[PDB]
Structure 1
Amino acid sequence: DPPAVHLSNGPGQEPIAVMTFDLTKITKTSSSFEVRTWDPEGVIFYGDTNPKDDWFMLGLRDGRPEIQLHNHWAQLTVGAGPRLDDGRWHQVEVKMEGDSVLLEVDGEEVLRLRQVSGPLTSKRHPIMRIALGGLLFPASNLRLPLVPALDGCLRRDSWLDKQAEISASAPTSLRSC
């Protein structure tokens, strides 16, 4: 089996990994991974350039994907797709394509948020953070609060553009599944 990691560490709700990227170097604006869980609710990943007004979250709520986003063009809270809380590995892809954010699950397009973003490259503060398994702000600050901990597993993950990655958090924390 390909190497999987725990999405939560237990008591605390701090992300298990944080990656930071130089925005002027991003050419690939998609992430993809595999996820397995029995948990109906929690954070799979969070991205931001600013935690007060340029941020994105993908989690589960009622076993289904949920996207929360606030940036200059769009502010939204959307559920879409099938229940992923069945203990089977699922393929997920999040892509930004033109002004749209796409969500793919198991090879199918399940959500397309159109006209939600201008070009990254020409963005207002050129550093983007990616956190896995939680937020980089307290849960009460979401548009719609959820309890962040997602007792699940992750593998085959690839975030945005490797060539633009400025830092990656200590991998001393990671816990194998």
Structure 2
Amino acid sequence: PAVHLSNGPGQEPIAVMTFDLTKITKTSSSFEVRTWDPEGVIFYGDTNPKDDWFMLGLRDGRPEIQLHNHWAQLTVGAGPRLDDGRWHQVEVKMEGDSVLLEVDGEEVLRLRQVSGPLTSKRHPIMRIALGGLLFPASNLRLPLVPALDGCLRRDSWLDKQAEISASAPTSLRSC
């Protein structure tokens, strides 16, 4: 079952999941994405919209991560273009103080020394928004137009056991 990463204008996310960081036993996520869209947000996450946020998106067809927290502030592009209309497996996880990005089974990016343990964040609640941000795009380190015209499927986010709740503005439109 595949869902549309964009719905309507393409402003707000198609879904927001909230997690209790003190209950996480897994700090990784994975999913498949397919699109012809060269720019947009795949997912945004934060423990604090001002002080500790993260965004994985596409720019010029390639993955881009923006991260802003106490330890690091960055805007980094990496990996092959994914806007070739084919399904691509994507994994994002924490490994020690690093954030690793794997695409189609290959590690394409490792942001080192960027964060303390998820389970140790001052604000023990993490939000994960799909297909959109939880603040205006103008507030990104480097703005981009969030709308991502693509499909998401086979997605797993951290541990379902740590998930506090999940919301969706409109009905998840299938692909």
Shift of 1:12: 4.0
1:132 and 1:163 mapped to 2: Cα distance?
19
- 1:45-99 alpha-carbon deviations (Å, 9 max, x no partner): 0000010110000000000000000011000000000000000000000010110
Q: TM-score, normalised by structure 1?
A: 0.97
Q: What aligned pairs does 1:108-119 form with structure 2 within 5 A after superposition? A: 108-119=106-117
Q: TM-score, normalised by structure 2?
A: 0.98
Range moving further from structure 2, 79-88 or 164-173? 164-173
- 1:105-148 alpha-carbon deviations (Å, 9 max, x no partner): 00000000011001111211110000000000000000000000
User: Hey, what does 2:149 align to over in structure 1?
Assistant: 151
Structure 1 counterpart SS, 2:120: coil
Range moving further from structure 2, 115-124 or 103-112? 115-124
Range moving further from structure 2, 8-17 or 128-137? 8-17
Shift of 1:40: 0.2
Shift of 1:10: 2.7
1:106 and 1:163 mapped to 2: Cα distance?
27
- 1:10-46 alpha-carbon deviations (Å, 9 max, x no partner): 3141000000000100110011000000000000000
Aligned length: 175
Quick check: 2:64–2:78 contact (8 Å CA) kept in 1? yes
1:122 and 1:42 mapped to 2: Cα distance?
30
Quick check: 2:26–2:159 contact (8 Å CA) kept in 1? yes
Stretches of structure 1 lacking an aligned partner (at least 5 in a row): none
Identity among equivalent pairs (%): 100
RMSD: 1.0
Structure 1 counterpart SS, 2:119: coil
Moved over 3 A (4+): none
1:53 and 1:125 mapped to 2: Cα distance?
10
Quick check: 2:15–2:166 contact (8 Å CA) kept in 1? yes
2:10 and 2:67 mapped to 1: Cα distance?
23
User: Hey, what does 1:176 align to over in structure 2?
Assistant: 174
Stretches of structure 2 lacking an aligned partner (at least 5 in a row): none
Quick check: 2:17–2:127 contact (8 Å CA) kept in 1? yes
